[PDB]
Symmetry: D2
Subunit: 225 residues, 4 copies
């Protein structure tokens, strides 16, 4: 399972979304150092382009294998191979936009395969997302909690706005291996710090190039117990 | 165009907590009486590991009784029909989004639902199949540049005696140009959705809805 | 029964919204069995307020609901000892209000004491920018729960410019009379129309009128 | 600033949760530049409480955060005419607490005043049934806004039987003194561990230790 994810790994994705009515589809092509926690992947909007909303809200649909897990904090995601794993997410924007996606991860030919299917609705016509007034996400810390053999993630994220300020978004994810969790080693409560940046945009966001660095940790601070 | 008797057909794809499924329905009703019954099959992914009640409202806005002075946004929209899109937020954290297309094809109402549900607690009246249908409800409809926005607090009755509350937000959007629709003011739709019959671990379900629109009749 | 066809009410309210402190009082009258009342409200300390008074409108009387025959009136049965309510209002743009009240009866006058705390009201939103024009009429749903009633209500403020600011209400109503001395209603609905009738001096004098009528679901069944 | 190696606090709190009025005070001591402190909390009135004390844990100290050099400390610059916070806490089972706080400095000593109001905590849920086992460690993201700060914090209470109960926190932090008499931080994080050390007499007496350390995002930026 460890011995299967490799010091350089590749991802191909297929995606199928609808946001405020607008159907679309995307693919991507990706690579990174999983054990160093880094990846970059190139995204296309194969159908539905150009999109009438800020691409940024989709940014986090495109990779939980590429988290740097230190020795002695179990990697739920790498362990889950060769079967793979699946996440379920709800994103709730402070202005009423709501997004829900289910993603399917798996491996084939030493190449990671993501199937995404998402559904966005109730985004205000006048608001920064439907106005394309977003300038990318702030770094974030996700807390992962073990629960029923899965992990539940929580994350308060914030999208940067033109003029300054931020649009806030709450994330709630459920991560579920497809191995039996009797064949797994669960971590405790732990934290994943990230910074996801757009590094290239083209043809009105129908081509987008993204980099993530993700590092996991236990809470380092001294107890009194 | 919308006759005093109308038939509907429904195809539905969904996913709830990663469990994928499909349904279809054949429905019959009285668009101007505000009544209908429809016969639902789960045809992939059944039997379902959660209460089918949470999908009840996925399965018909053309069947609301609109009194004479109160413009009917749904019946007006034909022949080109309308769409809706909804979020349901349960008080225990489960969230469903859903999108719907309503069209009119050679006399029949055709419905197409895609939905996606996540974060339902595992234990968990929804996931432990401990629900006993919805209470009657009142939806408030607000015009909102050219579409309607609905707001509704609903509650599922529970095995044991309580209620699981759920907050609905929906956006109704006519495919017709807005200039060809008289827009209603703010109004209310009182409903009672009931389960008539179920068989084979909720893989077959019959539902009946009655639904009557009104202005606020209180004086001023 | 101690609820007459005509009753008066007296209110004292103490409040903090985004850290701005204030107090109100009111004297009101209405017709309990017809479902109508008028309250004359003063902002007696901390005025004029830096926020839309409209958010406070629903803080000012459940005894005045018209209950039809065979729908138990939880609030009128609660006397002589009365009842309390606790409410959370969550606005769609982040404002949140918690509030609690006491309703009692002294010398046949209804007496309301209200405490409230409101926070996180955005500086550029319609509440703080004073852009609201009153509430839409509404339906509150009431559910029996372990001796009390849980109320649920999605509401909306009209805005300058035409749209609405939505608000979510969750209230718990608890009788001060032991519960087996009351007949509880099943699940039911309260239709309302609350309106501002007059105002003066930068929104520091307000009069409001409520009509409220309860009903069971009237639609046919099976 | 005027905040010494060692500092004490006294605190007075009054509030209502699901109708139940109470009042609290703490005496306190700690080290503000290594961001640690202990607080000995007394339920003077309304004891014992029908609800879990844990839900008040965070009501009881923003100057005791360790800020590294190069990240402005809003709270230490915000003195002598100090600062305030207004918080909303939304538990996933429906409990909602609002609360507001005053932080002033009067002759060697930190003064805390808190008023809170909690409603809609379900009667059969862990808070009213007292099935909680403390808070998990947390991180707060703090954003500049109008020369104030907005804190956002997903937090979790350990439960009996092993689950968690989650609670969303939103807090506005506002200095009582103007700008510029003060430098603003950028978007930054505070990592925290709150621990109950000692409990007595059905939760009427309680000792809390907090370690709080701020940082910027430490990760590589490709832009």
């Amino acid at each position: 399972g460890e011995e299967l994810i490799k010091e350089n790994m590749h991802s191909k994705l297929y995606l199928e979304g609808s946001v405020n009515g607008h159907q679309f589809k995307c693919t991507h092509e990706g690579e990174g150092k999983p054990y160093e926690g880094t990846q970059t992947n190139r995204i296309k909007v194969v159908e539905g382009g150009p999109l009438p909303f800020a691409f940024d809200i989709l940014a986090t649909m495109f990779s939980k294998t590429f988290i740097k897990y230190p020795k002695g904090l179990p990697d739920y995601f790498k362990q889950s191979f060769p079967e793979g794993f699946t996440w379920e997410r709800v994103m709730v924007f402070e202005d009423g936009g709501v997004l829900t996606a289910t993603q399917d991860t798996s491996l084939q030919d030493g190449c990671l395969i993501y199937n995404v299917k998402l559904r966005g609705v109730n985004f205000p016509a006048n608001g920064p997302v439907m106005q394309k007034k977003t300038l990318g996400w702030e770094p974030s810390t996700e807390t992962l909690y073990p629960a029923d053999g899965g992990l539940e993630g929580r994350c308060d994220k914030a999208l940067k706005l033109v003029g300054g300020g931020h649009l806030h978004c709450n994330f709630k994810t459920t991560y579920r291996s497809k191995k039996p969790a009797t064949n797994l080693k669960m971590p405790g409560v732990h934290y994943v710090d990230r910074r996801l940046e757009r590094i290239k945009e083209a043809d009105n966001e129908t081509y987008v190039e993204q980099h993530e660095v993700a590092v996991a940790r236990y809470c380092d601070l001294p107890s009194k117990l």
